[PDB]
Each structure stands twice: as structure tokens, then as C-alpha cells.
């Protein structure tokens, strides 16, 4: 069910049968998140899960996007994700466009902006690691020293993480190295998203939208605490649908709430099928 970094959750006929979903992990997960979604679909949709791979957004799209036209080649398209798999879903989607294929569908599963942009800058660099050494200081009931700010303003996001569990692990018990790797990348595969070089899409794209993120997002990152109405994707899409699901953000991807989305998109797809036939 694993081929490289596609994953196969329930294959295509052998010939002809229902446009296949396209669904792109989330930081820190699998395709099989996806599992309740595709019990809401139509029964004998196919699903195919992207996995993770390296590289800003847009390299990330240079590697899956030639995977999509080996397996499906014209179209028509249906992309969708979560969180970070709902931006790998767009980066897609405008990738296929450029070599003139028909995509018909992007789903963004609360893939919704942070509420304010999130400066690249030094300041930037400063004030969040400030900010996460203060809750380290209240969880783990220590004192952080002064931060080399120097040092963590030269590395992208993957260094700076890096750097940060290469100094905890000089000391004390060794730990395990799933831990350090899941920690590593959870962290810069959400990172990646905020220099995304969004650019305008001129097809539909449905954004379901719930309520708020939840606390660790907005911890993560303080911006993601206040939302725009768009998500963030109006000057991009003018063809935008919000399909407003409540909750929080983490929720969004598990019953119940998946009920409404796949409700949903079941509609959409068979509109899809329907104009096929
Ligand atoms: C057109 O412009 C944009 C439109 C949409 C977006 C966007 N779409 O999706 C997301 C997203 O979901 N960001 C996640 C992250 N980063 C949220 C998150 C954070 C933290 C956690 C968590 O649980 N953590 C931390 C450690 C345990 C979970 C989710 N942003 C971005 C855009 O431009 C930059």
C-alpha cells in the first residue's frame, strides 16, 4: 500500500471508474488521517495519499506533480488536504494548470492563513524563540540562558529546530531518534507554509472553514489566533466557496465533523462524474 511517498487507501478499477481523490498529508502525519473522510465519499472512489518529502512548497509540488500525471495524466483533478496538506493541494493544483491539465477540485480542509502575514525578518527570528524559551521556562520548570540569537538568525527553519534538540541532547538520556525526527519535521513542515509564494488560481476551490485553531496552533504561532473571512485565499481565488464546518482546526479531519465536509464533497463529485457522463 506504500509506493515511495504514494500511499494507496483505496485503489482505482483496472479500467475507466471514478475520478480518484488526491489527498496530501499534514504535518506530522500520514494519508491515513484521510480514512474517515473517504468513508463519507461515494462508495468505490479511489484515494490516493501523498507523503512527505523535502523542499520549500513549491519543490514539494515539482515532486508530487509529476507523480499525479504518471497516474492520472489529463484529469480531471480533485486535490485536497488538511493543515499543510490542504497548501501541498494548492501548490498542485497550479502546477498541473501550468502544463494544461483540467483540475476540477481543490479541497482545503481548514487550510485557512494565519490572521496577520508572519515577517521573515531577524525581530521575527528573536520574538519566537523568546516565546517558546518563556514556555519552556513555565512547562519544564527550568531557566533558559541567554539565546544565541546570532546563531539562530543565520539557519532557515530546519536549523534553528535542529540546532535547539542538538543542544538538549548533549546532556542527560539519549533520546530516542523517532522522537528527535518526528519533532524535527513536524516543526519545519508547518514552517514551510509561511514562505509559500501563493499565486492566483483560476479554477474552484472549496475551503472548508471551522471556527478557530486550536491552542497549540496558535502557541505554535501567535498569528494563527485571528482568521479573515477569506482565509487568506480571496485575492488569490476568485472562484472561493466557504463551507463554514464549526470546531477547531485539529477536529476538522475526524467524525463528526468529516461528516459534513464529505457530504459535502460527495456533491461535488458527483457533479464531476455526471459531467463525464
Ligand atoms: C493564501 O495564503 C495562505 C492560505 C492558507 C495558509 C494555511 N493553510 O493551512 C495552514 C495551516 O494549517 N497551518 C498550520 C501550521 N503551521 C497550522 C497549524 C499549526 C500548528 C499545529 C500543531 O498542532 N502543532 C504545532 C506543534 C503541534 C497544527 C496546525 N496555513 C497559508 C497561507 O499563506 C501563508
Same mark, same amino acid.
Given at each position: 500500500?506504500? /509506493?515511495?511517498? +504514494? ?32 468513508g463519507r465519499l461515494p462508495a /468505490? ?28 495524466? %489529463? ?7 488538511? #493543515? ?9 493544483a497550479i502546477g498541473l494548470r501550468?502544463?494544461? =491539465?483540467?483540475?476540477?477540485? @481543490? ?14 525578518? =531577524?525581530?521575527?527570528?528573536? =520574538?519566537?524563540?523568546?516565546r517558546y524559551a518563556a514556555f519552556? !521556562? =513555565? *512547562?519544564?520548570?527550568? *531557566? ?5 540569537? !546570532?546563531?539562530?538568525?543565520?539557519? /532557515? %527553519?530546519?536549523?534553528? @529546530? &535542529? ?5 538538549? #541532547?548533549? #546532556? ?29 488560481? /483560476? ?11 486550536? %491552542? $497549540? ?8 489566533? +485571528? ?10 481565488? #476568485? ?8 470546531? !477547531?482546526?485539529?477536529?476538522?479531519? $475526524? ?11 460527495? &456533491? ?6 455526471? $459531467?463525464?457522463?
Amino acid at each position: 500500500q506504500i /509506493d515511495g511517498f +504514494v500511499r494507496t487507501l483505496r485503489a482505482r478499477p483496472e479500467a475507466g471508474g471514478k475520478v480518484p481523490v488526491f489527498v496530501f498529508h499534514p504535518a506530522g502525519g500520514s494519508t491515513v488521517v484521510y480514512e474517515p473522510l473517504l468513508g463519507r465519499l461515494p462508495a /468505490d472512489t479511489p484515494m490516493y495519499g501523498f507523503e512527505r518529502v523535502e523542499g520549500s512548497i513549491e519543490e514539494r509540488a515539482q515532486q508530487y506533480v509529476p507523480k499525479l500525471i504518471e497516474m492520472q495524466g %489529463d484529469g480531471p483533478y480533485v486535490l485536497v488536504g488538511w #493543515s499543510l496538506g490542504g497548501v501541498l493541494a494548492y501548490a498542485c493544483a497550479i502546477g498541473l494548470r501550468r502544463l494544461g =491539465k483540467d483540475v476540477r477540485f @481543490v479541497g482545503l480542509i481548514d487550510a485557512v492563513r494565519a490572521g496577520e502575514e508572519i515577517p521573515q525578518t =531577524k525581530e521575527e527570528i528573536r =520574538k519566537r524563540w523568546d516565546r517558546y524559551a518563556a514556555f519552556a !521556562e =513555565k *512547562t519544564f520548570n527550568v *531557566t533558559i540562558p541567554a539565546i544565541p540569537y !546570532e546563531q539562530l538568525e543565520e539557519l /532557515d %527553519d530546519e536549523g534553528q @529546530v &535542529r540546532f535547539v534538540l542538538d543542544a538538549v #541532547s548533549q #546532556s542527560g538520556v539519549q533520546i530516542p531518534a523517532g522522537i528527535i525526527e518526528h519533532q524535527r519535521t513536524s516543526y519545519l513542515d508547518n514552517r514551510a507554509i509561511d514562505t509559500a509564494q501563493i499565486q492566483p488560481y /483560476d479554477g474552484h476551490v472549496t475551503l472548508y472553514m471551522a471556527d478557530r485553531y486550536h %491552542d $497549540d496552533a496558535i502557541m505554535f504561532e501567535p498569528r494563527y489566533a +485571528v482568521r479573515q473571512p477569506d482565509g487568506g485565499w480571496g485575492e488569490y481565488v #476568485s472562484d472561493l466557496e466557504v463551507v463554514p464546518i464549526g470546531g !477547531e482546526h485539529i477536529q476538522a479531519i $475526524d467524525e463528526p465533523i468529516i461528516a459534513k465536509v464529505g457530504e459535502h464533497m460527495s &456533491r461535488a463529485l458527483g457533479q464531476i462524474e455526471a $459531467d463525464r457522463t
